[PDB]
C-alpha cells in the first residue's frame, strides 16, 4: 500500500499519488507519508530528486515528516539520517530548498555525520543554494563530526566563488579540524593556488596538523607543484621544502629526468659556507653529499631510486607515505625479476611499521609477504631464514595485541592474522632444511600455541585447521584446507585437543561436520572423547551425512567403554551423583552427557 | 621431441642462408642466438647475446637477453614484451622463427608508448622523441661500447654494409 505511495514520490509521478490520495482520508494520509520505504520517507525522496510540484503538495497534506532523517544515495554511497532540506541541497534543487524553507524547515538540521544543509551545497558547489542558506541564518562554522568546515570542503573541491562568498560572509579562515587540518591544507591537497592566495588575503596562518604537516609539505606529498613553487618564496616559510617532491616524482610520476631537474637546484643553493646532513645509525645507500659525486645520476637508475627512498625516509620521518613507497619499490622490483633485493626491502618496511602502529595494514603487509612467497615457491629457491623471520615477526604482532589489557580485540582481525599464520605454516611444511632449525620452528609454534589466542566465534587454532572456511588463502593456485600435514604439526606441537568454542563444540565436532575420515582418525588417535555433548545435546557421530562416510569410515563401538555408557543414564535421569562417587569420575560424568 | 628434427633442419637452413642480424651459436632448447645492431639508427655499434628455452606452433618461446637494455618494451630482468608472444592477430601457429626475429629487430627501432613496461624508459624516450635529452644517447653509447668490447673479445664485429 504505502510502498506504492512512496515509489511514486521517488519516481515523481504526481498524477498517480493525487488519485491514491483521493481514495483515502486525511488522518491515514499521514501514516503512509511517514513510511520506512527502503529506509527513507516519501518527503525525503521527493526532495532528493527535485520534484518541486510534488514536495509542495506533500507538505499541504502533513508538515510533520519535514525534519525526518532517512536514507539517501549519492555517488553510490548511502547516507543515514539525512533530512529532506539537506538532501535537496546536496542535489542542487534550488527551488526545492526555497520551498522547504518557506514551510519552516530548520536550516540547521544535519545528517548523523553532523553535515549541515550549508555544507551539503558546498560539496558539489551549488553557489546559489549556498547564498540562500546563508541568508536564511545558516551557521558558517558548524562542521561535521571530524571538524571539517564548509570553507574547508569548499577549498578541497576547488570552488573559488563559494569559498570567496563564505569568507565574505565572515567565515573563520583559521578553523582546525579534529585532526588539525585547516582550509589552507585543503587548498594544498587540491592544488587550488587561487583559493590559497585568497585565504592569505584574510591573513590565514600556516600551521601543522595532527600529522605534523604544513600546507607546504602537504602540497609536496600530494604532488601539486603550483603550491610548492608558490610557497618557496612566501615569507611565512623558513631548500628543505624543494627536495621531498623530487622523491615524490620518482614515487608517483616515475619521471627520472624530472627528478634530476631538482636535486641540483636543491644542491646549488645548499652550497651557495657548507651544511652537513644527518647520518644513519636497503643496499647501503649512503646518500650523496658531494656535488662532484652528484653529477653522475642518469648513468644508473638504481642509485637515483635508492637516494630518493633515503631522502624521503629521512626528511618525512616514520606515516603511511614512507612505508607505502618502500613497499611500492619492493613490489616493482619483484615484478621486474629481481627477487633477491625485492624481498629485502619489505622486511625493513615491516620493522618500521612495527613501531607507530602497535594495524589495518600490518596484516596487509603480512598477506603481501604471503602472496609473494606463494608465487615464488609455487614453481630463486626460497631460503629458510627469510620465512622463519617472517613467521616470528608475524607472531610478535599477535603477542603484542593480546598481551595488553585495555580493550577486547574485535574477533575479525585476529581471524585474519590466524589465517595468515596457518598459511605460513602450510608453506613451511614443504621446504627442505636441516635438523638444527626444525627444533627452532617447533619451539616457535609451541610458544605461539601456549599463548592461547582466540578468533572469530571464539575459535581455536585447531578449529581453523579443521574448518573448510579457513581455506581463504588468496587468489593464487592452492593452499587448500583442511589438510593433514598442517594439522599434523599442530597436534605434534602440543595444541589443546579438547578446547571448547562459544557453541560448546570441539575439534572433533568441526571435523565431523565436514566428513573427513583422516582428520577424525588422527584426532581420536591423539585423544579426544568420542561422546562429547555440545550445547544442543548432540554428539560428534550424529553429525554425519550420506552413507559412504556413515558406514565403514569410523566404527563407534571401538571408541566407547562401559564407563561412557553408564554416564548417559545418570545425566538423563539426574540421580544426584554429587558425593556417591570418587572425585575423579565427577568430571567424567560432567563431560560425558 | 618430435619436432626437433624439423627445428634442426630450419636451424641449418638459416645458418647456411642468414638474412640480417641473425647469428646463431646453438649448443631451440638452448639457442644462444645473437642479435646484431643494424645501422642507420640508434646504437648499432655492437653485437648482443640472447637465450631461448622454447618448450613450437602452440607454445611460444621465451626470448631473453643477456646485456641489460633501456627502452619501453623490455623487462629489466631479461624479457621483452611482444604481442605475438601471447595467445585479433597474435601468435599465429605458423611463422615460427624468421618472423619472430624480424619482429624483434623491427620492434627494437620504435617502441610502443600506449602500453609500456619500463615507465621511466618510456618517459625518457618520449622526451627524446619530442626533442634534446641525450640521456638515451649516453646510455646507448655506453652499452654499445661494452658490446663492442665483448665482440672484439670473441667473434667478429658486424660491418655497416652486410
Amino acid at each position: 500500500l504505502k510502498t506504492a505511495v512512496f515509489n511514486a514520490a521517488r519516481d515523481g509521478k504526481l498524477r498517480l499519488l493525487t488519485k491514491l490520495l483521493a481514495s483515502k482520508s486525511k488522518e491515514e494520509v499521514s501514516s503512509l507519508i511517514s513510511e520506512k520505504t527502503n529506509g527513507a520517507t516519501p518527503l525525503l525522496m521527493a526532495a532528493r530528486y527535485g520534484h518541486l510540484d510534488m514536495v509542495e503538495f506533500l507538505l499541504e497534506q502533513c508538515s510533520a515528516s519535514i525534519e525526518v532523517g532517512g536514507s539517501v544515495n549519492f555517488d553510490g554511497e548511502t547516507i543515514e539520517g539525512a533530512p529532506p532540506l539537506w538532501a535537496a541541497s546536496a542535489a542542487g534543487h534550488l527551488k526545492v530548498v526555497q520551498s522547504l524553507l518557506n514551510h519552516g524547515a530548520s536550516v540547521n538540521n544535519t545528517t548523523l555525520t553532523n553535515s549541515t544543509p550549508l555544507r551539503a551545497a558546498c560539496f558539489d558547489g551549488h553557489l546559489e543554494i549556498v547564498k540562500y542558506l546563508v541568508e536564511h541564518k545558516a551557521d558558517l562554522e558548524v562542521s561535521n563530526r571530524h571538524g571539517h568546515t564548509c570553507l574547508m570542503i569548499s577549498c578541497y573541491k576547488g570552488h573559488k566563488e563559494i569559498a570567496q562568498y563564505l569568507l565574505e560572509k565572515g567565515a573563520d579562515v583559521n578553523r582546525k579540524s579534529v585532526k588539525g587540518n585547516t582550509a589552507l591544507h585543503d587548498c594544498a591537497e587540491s592544488g587550488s593556488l587561487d583559493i590559497m592566495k585568497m585565504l592569505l588575503m584574510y591573513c590565514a596562518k600556516m600551521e601543522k596538523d595532527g600529522y605534523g604537516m604544513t600546507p607546504l609539505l602537504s602540497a609536496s606529498v600530494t604532488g601539486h607543484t603550483n603550491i610548492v613553487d608558490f610557497l618557496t618564496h612566501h615569507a611565512q616559510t623558513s631548500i628543505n621544502a624543494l627536495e621531498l617532491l623530487g622523491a615524490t616524482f620518482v614515487d608517483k610520476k616515475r619521471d627520472l629526468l624530472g627528478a634530476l631537474k631538482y636535486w641540483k637546484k636543491a644542491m646549488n643553493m645548499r652550497y651557495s659556507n657548507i651544511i652537513s646532513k644527518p647520518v644513519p645509525q636497503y643496499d647501503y645507500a649512503k646518500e650523496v653529499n658531494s656535488a662532484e659525486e652528484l653529477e653522475g645520476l642518469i648513468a644508473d637508475p638504481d642509485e637515483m631510486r635508492m637516494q630518493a627512498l633515503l631522502i624521503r625516509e629521512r626528511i618525512l620521518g616514520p606515516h603511511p607515505d614512507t612505508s607505502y613507497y618502500i613497499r611500492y619499490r619492493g613490489a616493482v622490483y619483484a615484478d621486474s625479476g629481481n627477487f633477491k633485493r625485492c624481498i629485502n626491502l619489505w622486511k625493513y618496511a615491516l620493522d618500521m611499521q612495527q613501531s607507530n602502529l602497535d594495524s589495518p595494514m600490518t596484516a596487509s603487509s603480512l598477506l603481501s609477504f604471503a602472496e609473494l612467497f606463494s608465487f615464488m615457491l609455487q614453481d630463486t629457491t626460497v631460503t629458510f631464514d627469510d620465512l622463519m623471520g617472517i613467521l616470528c615477526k608475524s607472531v610478535l604482532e599477535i603477542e603484542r595485541a593480546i598481551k595488553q589489557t585495555q580493550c577486547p580485540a574485535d574477533p575479525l582481525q585476529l581471524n585474519k592474522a590466524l589465517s595468515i599464520i596457518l598459511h605460513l605454516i602450510c608453506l613451511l611444511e614443504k621446504v627442505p632444511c636441516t635438523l638444527e632449525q626444525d627444533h627452532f620452528k617447533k619451539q616457535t609454534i609451541y610458544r605461539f600455541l601456549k599463548l592461547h589466542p582466540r578468533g572469530k566465534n571464539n575459535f581455536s587454532p585447531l578449529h581453523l585447521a579443521v574448518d573448510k572456511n579457513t581455506t581463504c588463502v588468496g587468489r593464487y593456485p592452492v593452499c587448500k584446507f583442511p589438510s593433514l600435514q598442517v594439522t599434523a604439526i599442530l597436534i605434534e606441537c602440543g595444541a589443546d585437543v579438547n578446547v571448547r568454542d562459544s557453541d560448546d563444540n570441539s575439534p572433533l565436532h568441526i571435523a565431523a561436520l565436514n566428513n573427513h575420515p583422516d582428520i577424525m582418525n588422527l584426532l581420536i588417535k591423539s585423544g579426544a572423547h568420542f561422546d562429547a555433548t555440545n550445547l544442543h545435546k548432540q554428539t560428534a557421530s550424529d553429525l554425519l551425512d550420506e552413507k559412504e562416510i556413515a558406514k565403514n569410515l569410523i566404527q563407534p563401538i571401538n571408541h566407547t567403554t562401559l564407563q561412557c555408557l553408564a554416564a548417559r543414564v545418570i545425566v538423563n535421569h539426574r540421580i544426584y551423583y554429587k558425593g556417591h562417587i570418587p572425585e575423579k569420575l565427577e568430571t567424567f560424568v560432567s563431560l560425558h552427557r | 621431441t618430435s619436432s626437433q628434427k624439423a627445428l634442426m633442419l630450419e636451424l641449418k637452413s638459416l645458418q647456411e642462408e642468414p638474412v640480417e642480424g641473425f647469428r646463431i651459436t646453438l649448443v631451440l632448447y638452448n639457442w644462444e642466438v645473437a642479435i646484431f645492431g643494424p645501422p642507420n639508427t640508434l646504437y648499432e655499434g655492437g653485437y648482443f647475446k640472447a637465450h631461448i628455452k622454447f618448450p613450437y606452433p602452440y607454445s611460444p618461446p621465451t626470448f631473453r637477453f643477456l646485456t641489460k637494455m633501456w627502452h619501453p618494451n623490455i623487462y629489466e630482468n631479461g624479457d621483452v614484451c611482444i604481442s605475438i608472444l601471447h595467445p585479433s592477430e597474435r601468435w599465429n601457429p605458423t611463422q615460427n622463427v624468421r618472423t619472430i626475429l624480424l619482429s624483434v629487430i623491427s620492434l627494437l627501432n620504435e617502441p610502443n608508448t600506449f602500453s609500456p613496461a619500463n615507465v621511466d624508459a618510456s618517459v625518457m624516450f618520449r622526451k627524446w622523441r619530442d626533442s634534446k635529452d641525450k640521456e638515451y644517447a649516453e646510455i646507448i653509447r655506453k652499452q654499445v661500447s661494452a658490446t663492442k668490447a665483448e665482440a672484439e673479445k670473441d667473434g667478429v664485429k658486424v660491418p655497416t654494409t652486410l
Binding site: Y324, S368, E371 | -
Partner: peptide, 7 residues
Amino acid sequence: CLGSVNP
C-alpha cells in the same frame, strides 16, 4: 603488466 596494494 603483483602490485596488489593501494595507497
